Paper text:
α5 subunit-containing γ-aminobutyric acid type A (GABAA) receptors represent a promising drug target for neurological and neuropsychiatric disorders. γ-Aminobutyric acid type A (GABAA) receptors belong to the pentameric ligand-gated ion channel superfamily (pLGIC), and in response to the neurotransmitter GABA open an intrinsic ion channel that permits the passage of chloride ions and drives inhibitory neurotransmission in the mammalian central nervous system. In contrast, clinical modulators such as benzodiazepines that treat anxiety, muscle spasm, epilepsy and insomnia bind at the extracellular interface between the α-subunit principal face and the γ-subunit complementary face (between α1/2/3/5 and γ2) and do not induce obvious conformational changes to the pocket in structures solved so far. Instead, here we performed rational engineering to generate high-yielding, high-stability, simplified homomeric and heteromeric constructs based around the α5 subunit that could be structurally resolved by X-ray crystallography or cryo-EM.
Iterative rounds of screening and engineering of α5 subunits containing residue swaps from the β3 subunit, which readily forms homopentamers, identified a 12-mutation construct with comparable pentamer monodispersity and yield to the β3 homomer. To recreate the α5-γ2 allosteric site a further 11 residue swaps from the γ2 subunit were introduced into the complementary face of the α5 subunit to make a γ2-like face. This construct (α5V1) recapitulated 100% residue identity to the wild-type α5-γ2 pocket. The protein exhibited the common architecture of pLGICs, with each subunit from the pentameric ring contributing a β-sandwich extracellular domain (ECD) and a four-helix bundle transmembrane domain (TMD). Neither flumazenil nor RO154513, which is identical except for an azide at one end, interacts strongly with the loop-C T208 side chain methyl that is unique to α5, as revealed by a Thr to α1/2/3/4/6 Ser substitution in α5β3γ2 receptors only reducing affinity 2-fold for flumazenil and 3-fold reduction for RO154513.
Numbering used by the authors:
A (entry chain C), B (entry chain D), C (entry chain E), D (entry chain A), E (entry chain B): 15 to 322, 393 to 419
The structure:
Amino acid sequence: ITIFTRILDGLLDGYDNRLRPGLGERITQVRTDMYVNSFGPVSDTEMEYTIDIFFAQTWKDERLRFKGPMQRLPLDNRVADQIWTPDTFFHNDKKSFAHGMTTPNKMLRIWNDGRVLYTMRLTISAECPMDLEDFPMDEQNCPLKFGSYAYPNSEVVYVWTNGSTKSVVVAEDGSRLNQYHLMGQTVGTENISTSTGEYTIMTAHFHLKRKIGYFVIQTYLPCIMTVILSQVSFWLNRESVPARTVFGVTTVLTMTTLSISARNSLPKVAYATAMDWFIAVCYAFVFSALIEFATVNYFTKSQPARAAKIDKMSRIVFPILFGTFNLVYWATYLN
Amino acid sequence: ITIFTRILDGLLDGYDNRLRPGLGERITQVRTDMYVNSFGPVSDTEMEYTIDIFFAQTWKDERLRFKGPMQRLPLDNRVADQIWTPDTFFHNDKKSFAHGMTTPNKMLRIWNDGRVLYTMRLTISAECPMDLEDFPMDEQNCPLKFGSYAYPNSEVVYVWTNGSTKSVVVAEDGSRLNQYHLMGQTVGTENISTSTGEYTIMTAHFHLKRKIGYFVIQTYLPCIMTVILSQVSFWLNRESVPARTVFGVTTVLTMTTLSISARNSLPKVAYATAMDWFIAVCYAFVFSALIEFATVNYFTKSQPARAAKIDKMSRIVFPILFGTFNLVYWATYLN
Amino acid sequence: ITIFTRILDGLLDGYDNRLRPGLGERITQVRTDMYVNSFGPVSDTEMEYTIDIFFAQTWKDERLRFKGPMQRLPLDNRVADQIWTPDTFFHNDKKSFAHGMTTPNKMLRIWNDGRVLYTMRLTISAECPMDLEDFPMDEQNCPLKFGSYAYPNSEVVYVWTNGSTKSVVVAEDGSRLNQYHLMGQTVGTENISTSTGEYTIMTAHFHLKRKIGYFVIQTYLPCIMTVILSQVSFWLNRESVPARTVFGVTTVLTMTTLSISARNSLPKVAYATAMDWFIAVCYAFVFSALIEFATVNYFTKSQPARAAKIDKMSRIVFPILFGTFNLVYWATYLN
Amino acid sequence: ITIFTRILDGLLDGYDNRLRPGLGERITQVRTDMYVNSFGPVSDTEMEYTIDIFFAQTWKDERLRFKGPMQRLPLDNRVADQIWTPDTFFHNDKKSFAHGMTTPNKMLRIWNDGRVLYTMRLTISAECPMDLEDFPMDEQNCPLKFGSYAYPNSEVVYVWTNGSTKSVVVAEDGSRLNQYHLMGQTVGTENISTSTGEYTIMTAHFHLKRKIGYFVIQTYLPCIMTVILSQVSFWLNRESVPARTVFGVTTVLTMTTLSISARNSLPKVAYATAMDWFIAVCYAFVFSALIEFATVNYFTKSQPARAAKIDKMSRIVFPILFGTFNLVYWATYLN
Amino acid sequence: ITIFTRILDGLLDGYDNRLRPGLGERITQVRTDMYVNSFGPVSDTEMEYTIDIFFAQTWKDERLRFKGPMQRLPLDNRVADQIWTPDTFFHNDKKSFAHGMTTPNKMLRIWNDGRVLYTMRLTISAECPMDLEDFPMDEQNCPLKFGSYAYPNSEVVYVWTNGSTKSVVVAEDGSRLNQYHLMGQTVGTENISTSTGEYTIMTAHFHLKRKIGYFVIQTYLPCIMTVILSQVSFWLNRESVPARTVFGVTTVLTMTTLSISARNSLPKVAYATAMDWFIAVCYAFVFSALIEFATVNYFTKSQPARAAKIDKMSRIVFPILFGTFNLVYWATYLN
Ligand SMILES: CC(=O)[C@H]1CC[C@H]2[C@@H]3CC[C@@H]4C[C@H](O)CC[C@]4(C)[C@H]3CC[C@]12C
Ligand SMILES: CC(=O)[C@H]1CC[C@H]2[C@@H]3CC[C@@H]4C[C@H](O)CC[C@]4(C)[C@H]3CC[C@]12C
Ligand SMILES: CC(=O)[C@H]1CC[C@H]2[C@@H]3CC[C@@H]4C[C@H](O)CC[C@]4(C)[C@H]3CC[C@]12C
Ligand SMILES: CC(=O)[C@H]1CC[C@H]2[C@@H]3CC[C@@H]4C[C@H](O)CC[C@]4(C)[C@H]3CC[C@]12C
Ligand SMILES: CC(=O)[C@H]1CC[C@H]2[C@@H]3CC[C@@H]4C[C@H](O)CC[C@]4(C)[C@H]3CC[C@]12C
Ligand SMILES: CCOC(=O)c1ncn2c1CN(C)C(=O)c1cc(F)ccc1-2
Ligand SMILES: CCOC(=O)c1ncn2c1CN(C)C(=O)c1cc(F)ccc1-2
Ligand SMILES: CCOC(=O)c1ncn2c1CN(C)C(=O)c1cc(F)ccc1-2
Ligand SMILES: CCOC(=O)c1ncn2c1CN(C)C(=O)c1cc(F)ccc1-2
Ligand SMILES: CCOC(=O)c1ncn2c1CN(C)C(=O)c1cc(F)ccc1-2
Ligand SMILES: *[C@@H]1O[C@H](CO)[C@@H](O)[C@H](O)[C@H]1NC(C)=O
Ligand SMILES: *[C@@H]1O[C@H](CO)[C@@H](O)[C@H](O)[C@H]1NC(C)=O
Ligand SMILES: *[C@@H]1O[C@H](CO)[C@@H](O)[C@H](O)[C@H]1NC(C)=O
Ligand SMILES: *[C@@H]1O[C@H](CO)[C@@H](O)[C@H](O)[C@H]1NC(C)=O
Ligand SMILES: *[C@@H]1O[C@H](CO)[C@@H](O)[C@H](O)[C@H]1NC(C)=O
Ligand SMILES: *[C@@H]1O[C@H](CO)[C@@H](O)[C@H](O)[C@H]1NC(C)=O
């Protein structure tokens, strides 16, 4: 153990962590790996998502080159703080933190040739814009961008691990989401020209397809039952004005109540959503069934034969219409 | 007191906490104990649970081997920071923190032979997936996985305490939960092969049985009374179209109102829940009682004798049906 | 000022804060005082309560014994870190923090004989289980336990201040609670045998009696008015089937609406609450008034005289029953 | 610049920040100034308020007395930490924090004679009990108490700035509140005898007048319309039992619905609020209009002429009563 | 690399970060740049907005002027802490924090001539008062003011960038908001006289125009449908007192239900909002249609010809009126 105490002391004696490795000589290339331990909750209201990853980075540093019996130096964060590390930051991040129990989860390993490995565990809430036009039969793509904050392209460059280690890995246990399904992952690299030089930023996209199960139970199913409720009126006595009247208005109150409740749980966007149309049409089918009787009753005095054909015809026309509406609605958005 | 100041200074003189004990010589074996002071709130929506534990770890470090009058060295965190400790982290953790008042709750004890005792207090929110198909007659198993972050199996190994201290202990005060019951605990050890070596991870499962009391009061009971409400209609005058009509529709509005409220308090999962079916069937029993009258009124003019048997039988079939339905529902899920 | 700088420097010169005072000689006895500046919000849902206290502790450290003109040394937190202090932790704590503005509120005072006074201000959210069977005519007792984390009975012992300084003091300004009333305070001491030795834990119980004012306004009163609403039906025309029918069902919808709203605000426990019964009985009084008419209507054809006695007697039986129900309900739980 | 480096080094050379200025000689007098940058949200439910202030303190420290070309030493927080400062804490505080971006906002300035200026920016959530008996025609007064935590009157004394600089200043931008109006400010000084000596505490009261606008829109106005709704019944056909019956019960359901929602937004106190009475009376005016008809219908069979005067009289008596009630209600509380 | 280690050591050798550059000779001028990476959520209730910016500042410090092969010194935060920096704080800030993952996002660059570049990433929640009289056809302007906390105009001055870097830049991805649209940005400088000298404060205004889409879907449309619902009553049988009565009251109950939910999502201000009027008028149109029938029914017995003209005229007057109402409402506020 005393052998390694002098090796560490020798490497760090006179080591200037303020300067990057290969300053004025080479561009420090960093091979970045990643393992998604858990895909945190996604929010279609706040347009963000949380993710728990093991973010690994390896680069070249000649100052740490040593020769000894061991081929690797297993070390903790106590050394990761004393040496230089890339100040990798996440561009689209909202807030982030590195897990600290028991000690700040930072693993450092130094090989003879100077190869460094500096990985940590991060829970980060990043941005994810969404176009909820097809919501809840929706598909969104949440990116994760990260690069160096202080080092332009001339000073530092990032690249993904190619071949040995998979670029992005995701655990099946953590990927489980109540309302989304993780389709896959995509990685890429790009250069960006900013007012403080051109930086290389590394993107990692997580494709998501929304699960409609919760919404069939909450909104679609009760709406369907409430338009069928309105269409019961056609089979009741046409001459019983109070019965047909109170039935038509109470069902509108029912649909009006149902649309009020469904509104609270839906994203607060400023455009029409695929569900917003389903609720709209259903309200029209409930409102229409009421107007249907208002016409039936208006003609009862002088044109009762006409008011009878309207009601009897409405018994088949209404369900056939709402039936075909669903045939088109689901056939359109489920594609 | 002056004796112990030189012993501590002597041990820490030249002590390199950056290196694990026995590097290149022995494997640091850590005996892990745990005491659940409180089982924090469990969340079936966020699929997580909070837990408050005293997490103890003991290993052997020859560098701390000393000779003196005392057999043990009672010390605080002021020494725990100066020595080496295993960087044990919890794999399924979402967020964790160690209690700090008055001082960081870390207890250190060093015996003559060099065995160390390093325990701390942790409140941690860990992951716990759930299959809420039988909710609220549910059973879940929440795990707690923890291992070393930087040291694979070759460098460090974990084992549960055998004999003196029980692996996992639970306090009678804290395990109390409003909606859950802690059945028991299970401990285990397993090896995992990762891209940074093979680590030993220690699992601790907490079995949970849900308490249906809250849900019988909130949803089951009012639904049952509201279908019984619908079945009152069969005993009223069939020829009074407004009475039977307004009664049939108002109860649907009532059942529709009841189902809207129950939906908010239930988990926002995307599959059918055991309660979701009970609400569904009840809505069907209310909707049927209405359709039952719609037929009675439809046949009342030309087929009054036929419409009479429908109403009278509905007086017994409906309650007998809903009665037998409950017999099957509860008998099925309570098993 | 130059006199005290050498006294302080002399005391701290060679002072080892890692070791407790009187190690291997005497047991460090700590007299703990407490002043509740404010009793934070109590939660009957999360089973928790917040409290803001000035937590004072005094012991004797021979190393700090000095001789000088001043009898005591007024000092800030800048010295509290340099000396030894008991690592007092709160056993039932959930989350705690020490006020830091302007500077960390820690007061240190050192007397000639070496007796120390070390107090701080703490806001702590501690556990408080509740048996809400009589809720909201309830009484709860919230404890506050604190002891040493690293020093067993043999090494450190706690005792309450008796006589000179009051053990626990509470300001009437902070004791104000919207839904609770602070009856009093009780203090005690006990020994607990743990796997790391036997420790002494100090308990402080705060007795609470719940205030029913908010609930009479929110729930009891509207329920009473809504069952009296149901009993208006007996005075209406028996031959008007729609009038009596819509009145009976709409009031059930009203009571069903009223009970749904009261449900969200009430604690989410899994057992029957004293109020849950009051809402239950009231719903029964509204549901019965409806069933009462269904029977009246069922007998109207062949037994109208019997259907008349039912309605007319119900005008007095119902209010006398609900009247006497309140007489019994309130008389039982208010005791 | 090298001149000031030697002056600062000279002043801080041998400076003991653990000791207060004038220890064992004089009482350190601190003139405290304050500037309310913003008056954070006020909460009548949690009985607290947030406030953002620039908290200034000035005293004399003879050790910092220097002679040089400059008359004052403009310094940042880097020096404020190195010297002694009063450990001023806010007694009624619940949680506070000092702004840190870019650097901890602490301004230090040292004059020749040794007078120091040490100001900081603080956002603090302080306590503010309220007597909401006249709510929402309300007026509250929130205090702000602060003194030294470790230094009694004998060692430190606080006094407000007088003359040139005003004790408390408030910006018109921050004083804007959605539901409150800031009447003015009051400052005062007092001594308090505590178990750790007698301290001097400085109070700053902020007088508040509540804005009734939000509640007229939410609660008062719809209630007024809903009692006028109930009084429509008197003008409808008295012999139409279903019409008058369904109208009477639906308005009660409407008023019962309205009172449930207004309740959620109101403070959860345990006494009657000025609004609680307005809602109560309105419910009584809706409930009475229903009983009015129940009487009309009860007398219609045998005493129809009397049932006519009741209905016709109620057309004038009811609105005149609700009219005079409002005349008295507003005249009482708005005074 | 060893060349730069002596240069840095040479520059920092004897460097006093407590003193500003050019003290007692020149005014430290700081050119401030800004890049809005994301425009965080805006709150019309809390009157605040969150923003994520790259806040850059550049000044000249002669002490850091060096001669070497490189023209600039790429450095991290490890040096930014060791040198002097302007203590720039944001005046209207409520809560701010600088991103810390991986390392504190502070970029430092030192040119030969002594020019420094000190930029950081900040997420800050600043104040933004609003006049929501025209809400939701609204326009608001949220400012962002920042200056030096300890250095008045005489010692430090702030200025906007000269043309190299644009003063305020906004990212195309992050500026997207659900309910607002970012029109543009305006920058300015002003002097303010405070009790601690006169400071220069830098303003940055972000103009916002509200999106009416969400409110058309949530409130306007259902209100439109519910007043049209009320106007159906004129076409139904005038002599059917129950039919017209239950329809009139239920639509009021429906509109009354609609107004409470609309109130929940709207800002809790104490003045009348453009929507508050639209909801009010719609309630008047539903209530009026009810009073319309009460008049028709009151005249039905003795003045049926008058009760016929009233009802028939109402079929056109009501929709024509509500039609023109929208024409004026939308035409006025949409301008
Ligand atoms: C002529 C007739 O059979 C009546 C019965 C119900 C009436 C409708 C009710 C809803 C609308 C009310 C509005 O005031 C005028 C247009 C609308 C659409 C009315 C047009 C005329 C209708 C259809
Ligand atoms: C002929 C008859 O007794 C009528 C009375 C109520 C009617 C039902 C009401 C609900 C549905 C409405 C839909 O438009 C057609 C199918 C459904 C299921 C109707 C079929 C015909 C029924 C059963
Ligand atoms: C025969 C008679 O006076 C009728 C009127 C209302 C009816 C009750 C309505 C509620 C229940 C409905 C259920 O379907 C059968 C039992 C229950 C309890 C009925 C039994 C028979 C009653 C009491
Ligand atoms: C005789 C008469 O005009 C009836 C019509 C409505 C009835 C009241 C309804 C509400 C109450 C119901 C209770 O069961 C008895 C007392 C109460 C207050 C009744 C007393 C008698 C009244 C006033
Ligand atoms: C005579 C007549 O056509 C009646 C029918 C509905 C009545 C109105 C109902 C609402 C109000 C009730 C109040 O008690 C008196 C004024 C108000 C405004 C009444 C005035 C008289 C009206 C308009
Ligand atoms: C794919 C790159 O992987 C990392 O960067 C990494 N960094 C730390 N660890 C890993 C591997 N990994 C996915 C773990 O879960 C894990 C499990 C352990 F028991 C100990 C360490 C790690
Ligand atoms: C316009 C003012 O900009 C800055 O002062 C600034 N400060 C840091 N950075 C920038 C440039 N900028 C707009 C970035 O996005 C960026 C991107 C990177 F990958 C690394 C650093 C920065
Ligand atoms: C069984 C696991 O034991 C620990 O890991 C442990 N660590 C600290 N403590 C314990 C023992 N234990 C269960 C306590 O509750 C306790 C009680 C005290 F008053 C002081 C210290 C502890
Ligand atoms: C019960 C032990 O109390 C303390 O140890 C204590 N610590 C701080 N303070 C006290 C006394 N006390 C009850 C106060 O309220 C108070 C009032 C002040 F103005 C200044 C300091 C304190
Ligand atoms: C009245 C008490 O005032 C202070 O003690 C104070 N402390 C800090 N500052 C002030 C003056 N003041 C009212 C400011 O707004 C201000 C404005 C600045 F740009 C920089 C510093 C300050
Ligand atoms: C992008 O950046 C990388 C950084 O190494 C560089 O090699 C490549 O030539 C650049 N290409 C473009 C188009 O910017
Ligand atoms: C797992 O690892 C431990 C390391 O101590 C070893 O003793 C055990 O045999 C291993 N078991 C398996 C199944 O790999
Ligand atoms: C606690 O145990 C100690 C011995 O360690 C004993 O002296 C003391 O009296 C005990 N206290 C109580 C309350 O039993
Ligand atoms: C409070 O105490 C101070 C001494 O520190 C004294 O000067 C002052 O007069 C006292 N106030 C009152 C009201 O007695
Ligand atoms: C313009 O501003 C930049 C800020 O970095 C500065 O370096 C440069 O010297 C300035 N030049 C002029 C002409 O203002
Ligand atoms: C701001 O103050 C400085 C102080 O010298 C002055 O030169 C400048 O003209 C002032 N600018 C404004 C807009 O007041």
